[PDB]
């Protein structure tokens, strides 16, 4: 009956377990695992830098930032003879470039 006037409304939300994702697609849909901008020749045959930045809320303690980049971990594994086994790893785009 006698509620206080001049009161103001506060909103928030909570996502647990989620890990926010940005798909590297033109229309942000899932038209494939290999996306449409992934087989673009503008990116694969020309080296590009990357400058992204985030603006999180401040907290009272140090904090990491668990950033993920979608790559394609793939293996092949032959067994050509008896007691013979070998692999050939890659992941692209972020390959550990040591072999040359």
């Amino acid at each position: 009956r006698n509620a206080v006037p001049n009161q103001v409304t506060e909103r928030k939300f909570l996502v647990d377990r989620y890990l926010w994702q940005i798909p590297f697609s033109s229309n942000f849909l899932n038209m494939g695992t290999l996306t449409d901008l992934g087989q673009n020749v503008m990116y694969a045959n020309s080296s590009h830098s990357l400058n992204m930045q985030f603006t999180v809320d401040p907290m009272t303690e140090p904090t990491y930032l668990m950033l993920l980049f979608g790559v394609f971990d793939q293996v092949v594994i032959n067994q050509p003879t008896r007691s013979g086994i070998s692999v050939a790893y890659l992941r692209l785009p972020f390959a550990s470039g040591s072999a040359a």
Partner: protein, 51 residues
């Protein structure tokens, strides 16, 4: 670019094609009790032309 992605099946042919013809007819017969056909990667690509 193109032959690198076909050796590892980033893109290219599905599992019904790059396997041997006798190996496909095996893993269809024994699929109900001894599954092999989940040990071969299957590509799945976007059109990227006219979408």
């Amino acid at each position: 670019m193109e032959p690198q992605r076909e050796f590892f099946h980033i893109a290219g042919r599905s599992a019904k094609e790059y396997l041997s013809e006798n190996l496909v007819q095996f893993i269809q017969a024994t699929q109900n009790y001894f599954n092999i056909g989940e040990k071969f990667r299957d590509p799945y690509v976007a059109p990227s032309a006219g979408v």
